[PDB]
Amino acid sequence: QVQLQESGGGLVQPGGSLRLSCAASGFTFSNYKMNWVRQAPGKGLEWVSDISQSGASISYTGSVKGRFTISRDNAKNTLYLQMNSLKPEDTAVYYCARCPAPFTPFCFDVTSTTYAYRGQGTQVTV
Amino acid sequence: LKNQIRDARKACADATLSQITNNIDPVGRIQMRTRRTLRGHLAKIYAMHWGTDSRLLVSASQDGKLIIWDSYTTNKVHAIPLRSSWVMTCAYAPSGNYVACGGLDNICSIYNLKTREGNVRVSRELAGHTGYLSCCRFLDDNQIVTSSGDTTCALWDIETGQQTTTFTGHTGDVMSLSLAPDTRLFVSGACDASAKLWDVREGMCRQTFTGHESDINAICFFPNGNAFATGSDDATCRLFDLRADQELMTYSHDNIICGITSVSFSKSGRLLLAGYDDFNCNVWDALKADRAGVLAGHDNRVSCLGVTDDGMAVATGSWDSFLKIWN
Amino acid sequence: TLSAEDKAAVERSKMIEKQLQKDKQVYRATHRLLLLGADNSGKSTIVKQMIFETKFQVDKVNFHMFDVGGQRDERRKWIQCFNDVTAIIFVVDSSDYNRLQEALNDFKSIWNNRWLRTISVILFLNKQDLLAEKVLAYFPEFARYTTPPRVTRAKYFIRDEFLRISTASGDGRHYCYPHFTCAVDTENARRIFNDCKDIILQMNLREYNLV
Amino acid sequence: LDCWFDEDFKFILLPVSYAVVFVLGLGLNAPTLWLFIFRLRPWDATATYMFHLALSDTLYVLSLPTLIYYYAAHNHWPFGTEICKFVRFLFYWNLYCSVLFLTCISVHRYLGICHPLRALRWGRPRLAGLLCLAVWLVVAGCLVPNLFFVTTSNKGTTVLCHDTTRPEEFDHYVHFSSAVMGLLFGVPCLVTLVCYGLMARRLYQPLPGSAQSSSRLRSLRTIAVVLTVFAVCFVPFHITRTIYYLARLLEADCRVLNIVNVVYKVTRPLASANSCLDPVLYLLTGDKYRRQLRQL
Amino acid sequence: LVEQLKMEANIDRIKVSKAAADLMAYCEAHAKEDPL
Ligand SMILES: O=c1ccn([C@@H]2O[C@H](COP(=O)(O)OP(=O)(O)OP(=O)(O)O)[C@@H](O)[C@H]2O)c(=O)[nH]1
């Protein structure tokens, strides 16, 4: 039973900072690459960042790079998102997501409308 | 109340197949050699099915031709052209005079074999599915149950062409189904890493088995009818018991990184044959969680696997246009 | 051995095999192309300027391009049915940057797929008149970018953004072909024809013991 | 009957080169010969032509040992007339069918590279099989006169096995050999050179949008190597053969006859070495590297 | 979902060892007729 749960949001100052932590259970952490999913009001499921296996490759978004830090801990079985700089246009819900293929860097369906391995994220309000 | 369900599942704390069946005779190295190589198709083989007569064998490929073999003599009895070239399911009615097919066209076309005019014609078409067909199996001469990639399955009627019952409670896309030996129940594994047991007469789910961590690709009932095996994209099979409502075995290896493409059981339920995306098959022991053989004859992939009704042979397709009968 | 029924069955099998051999030439001589894109991308009008399947030929070589859209917005599984297509005609709407990020991401996911890693992708930046109108009248690397006027730099910025994935992760078994199309461009059929010609040439180089 | 030729400039070179070519041919052609039938059954057009060329090379090198014995025995054929006739037919039969199979593979590559879409618009392995069968039949039919021509005579030694006909019937053999040589080399040689040059010209110029790769350079190097090997193996052999046969036909002074004899007998090992150079050229590069590595 | 979980709560009515023994007895009984 793949389950994901996020925490650490809902209190941001313009230019402030917090930290996002999603917990995982029911699957091996190291064999999968996990993304970040952003859902703004009146908008579809967006994309934020990426981490590949044991942090081999790192990718961001143009509006994300330079202010967001993606961290992961295979031993602790949790994936982190550090928020350094903020603007009031990133108030959304952060879905800690992944892709079903293990030992493969193919995250084809992550931002789908319905998705089994995408936990219910935490609200972030600036 | 999922915590209560997991506590009820954990109430059977002594759940270890490696201990109850530890002191048993191992099956041993199953050395199966190719007997026939039905090299008549044009492109990737996606699906195949055996007949009740245990000789005739239907198969579908990428080129859009649905062919019917005779594995005893390696003779193409029929070759039915298809309107849509992307078909990934096959069927063969127990009466033997009907063959179904389906795929990305979201239509379960049924072709009338052995008609009075001696020709193959589309007897009926079932167009009530909003997603790509994944598996269709002939319940009888009059009913067929189909599962599509639109999260729901459906039971069809040939005379009317409309669904008699539907099974809408699922997540993800249903990937394959398998009927019970009594033909009163059936099971469906989907892309939500879960498999659900359904009742044909009532049309309601009875149990859900969430043991896998990736999309379940193939699922096949145990010959006894009270179990099944699920092969998923996590490169690991599992065996689920309907009564226990909990995974029993986990046929996983460290050197296996390619997901499962097809799963079939032998006649006695002792040998679990699993097709792999690792360029070959694998012949898993049912209750030992150890390998017993490798069918490495194929040279592209393995996409379908079927065991003959009386257990006298098996047939494995491939992404090369070959069909190898093993024994 | 050879009975009356057995001889008839063998003759029927030979007739079936002859029909299959006749159809093999037709199947091998037709090129199957998968049309991919987003809702805002005008992939439909690219076909209209020549599951919904279309048929067209350029130099008596028959191309059959498929625009499947009846699925439930999940393409992990049915995208494997297009493993033997000669090319992918992934179409980008380059006039919507917020959608351009998602186009970049799913082009990357298509490029890095396990089964599509050997399938060349023809890249069409569909909306270019709209892009020219928008620029003439998001990404922080645009300021620190140099042309390999403003609309040309924007066009090549998007092209290089796609080619960054098309090059840094390519295995050499497939390539991306970027093209600049419009709403009224009528050379798309010949562009796809020439790109497929080169794709088949590369497979022929690999299979002829030359590379 | 005539003025004789030099001896030690051939008896010390031809047997050694022929034995080396023989052992290398069976060391390099038999494994791929069995691979092309009962390893993975490759029988598309490319593998059809490659297997037929490998079979031709095996037959060519198997035609050697009796004539290596002939050459090392200082122009002596104790075996008999029948073996002399049959094996000096088989020598040129395998040589010319190997050249024709090289030309067939060159035309196949030209069709598949210069016009690929048309090439698989009209194409079938049945055409390749029929072409190979026609090649075997045509070469055998046109070297039918070779059986009547190669004869055994007792003139200077106890037994000679004349590669040409008897000295009293050389005017027939010069015409026959010139005809078959012109056809079964010049048309294959020009066809192969034209096709390989055209494919190299196509590969040189970068046409596409972003199919820029080192494939078009590695294939160009392979094509250049193949063309150079084919030329240096076959063109000097046939050119020296023409010069020597015309020198004998004109009945010139024995000095130029000795000179052209020496150049022909030193270009002969170059022609023989193609039976060993064909596998290490056509069976190495590409997927056959992986095939041979797996089957090793 | 809560209703389906409620139905699934009342269906866990067997032991794992019983299922393992039943499957073992089934393959033992039918091993004679299995050609593989
Ligand atoms: O004018 C001649 C012609 C022929 N010969 C001698 O006749 C013998 C047979 O020579 P052939 O004329 O029968 O064939 P060839 O030129 O290809 O030479 P070989 O391959 O057989 O070695 C050779 O040993 C040659 O020296 C002469 O000495 N003078």
Residue numbers in the entry:
A (entry chain N): 1 to 126
B (entry chain B): 14 to 340
C (entry chain A): 11 to 60, 207 to 253, 264 to 303, 311 to 321, 332 to 394
D (entry chain I): 25 to 320
E (entry chain G): 15 to 50
Question: Any passages from the paper?
Answer:
The nucleotide-responsive P2Y receptors (P2YRs), consisting of eight members in humans, belong to δ-branch of class A rhodopsin-like G-protein coupled receptors (GPCRs). Purinergic P2Y2 receptor (P2Y2R) represents a typically extracellular ATP and UTP sensor for mediating purinergic signaling. Similar to other P2Y1R-like receptors, P2Y2R couples to the canonical Gq/11 protein, leading to the activation of subsequent intracellular Ca2+ wave propagation. In this study, we determined the cryo-electron microscopy (cryo-EM) structures of the apo P2Y2R in complex with Gq, ATP-bound P2Y2R in complex with Gq or Go, and UTP-bound P2Y4R in complex with Gq.
For comparative analysis, we also applied the same strategy to determine the UTP-bound P2Y4R–Gq complex structure at a global resolution of 3.14 Å. The active forms of the P2Y2R and P2Y4R, when bound to the Gq protein, assume similar configurations, as evidenced by an all-atom root-mean-square deviation (RMSD) of 0.8 Å for the receptor structures. The ATP and UTP are bound to the orthosteric ligand-binding pockets of P2Y2R and P2Y4R in a similar orientation. Compared with the ATP-bound P2Y2R–Gq complex structure, P2Y4R exhibits a generally similar extracellular arrangement in its UTP-bound Gq complex structure, encompassing the N-terminus, ECL2, and transmembrane helices. As a result, similar to the interactions in P2Y2R, an extensive polar network is also formed between the 5′ triphosphate moiety of UTP and P2Y4R, involving residues K341.31, Y952.64, R1123.29, Y2686.58, R2726.62, K2897.36, and R2927.39 from the transmembrane helix core, as well as H186 and T188 from ECL2. The only difference is that it is N99ECL3 in P2Y4R instead of E29Nter in P2Y2R which stabilizes the ribose by a hydrogen bond. Unlike P2Y2R, wherein the adenine of ATP is sandwiched between Y23Nter and F27Nter, the uracil of UTP in P2Y4R fits into a narrower sub-pocket formed by D26Nter, W28Nter, and F29Nter. Structure overlay between ATP-bound P2Y2R and UTP-bound P2Y4R structures suggests that the sub-pocket of N-terminus in P2Y2R is capable of accommodating both ATP and UTP, whereas the sub-pocket of N-terminus in P2Y4R disfavors ATP recognition due to the steric clash between the adenine moiety and the backbone carbonyl oxygen of C27Nter. Notably, a substantial difference between the two purinergic receptors is that the intracellular end of TM1 and intracellular loop 1 (ICL1) in P2Y2R show displacement toward the center of transmembrane helix bundles by ~3 Å compared to P2Y4R (measured from the Cα atom of C601.59 in P2Y2R to the Cα atom of F621.59 in P2Y4R). However, in the P2Y4R–Gq complex, this hydrogen bond is lost because the corresponding residue is a negatively charged residue D682.37 in the P2Y4R, which explains the outward displacement of ICL1 in P2Y4R compared to P2Y2R.
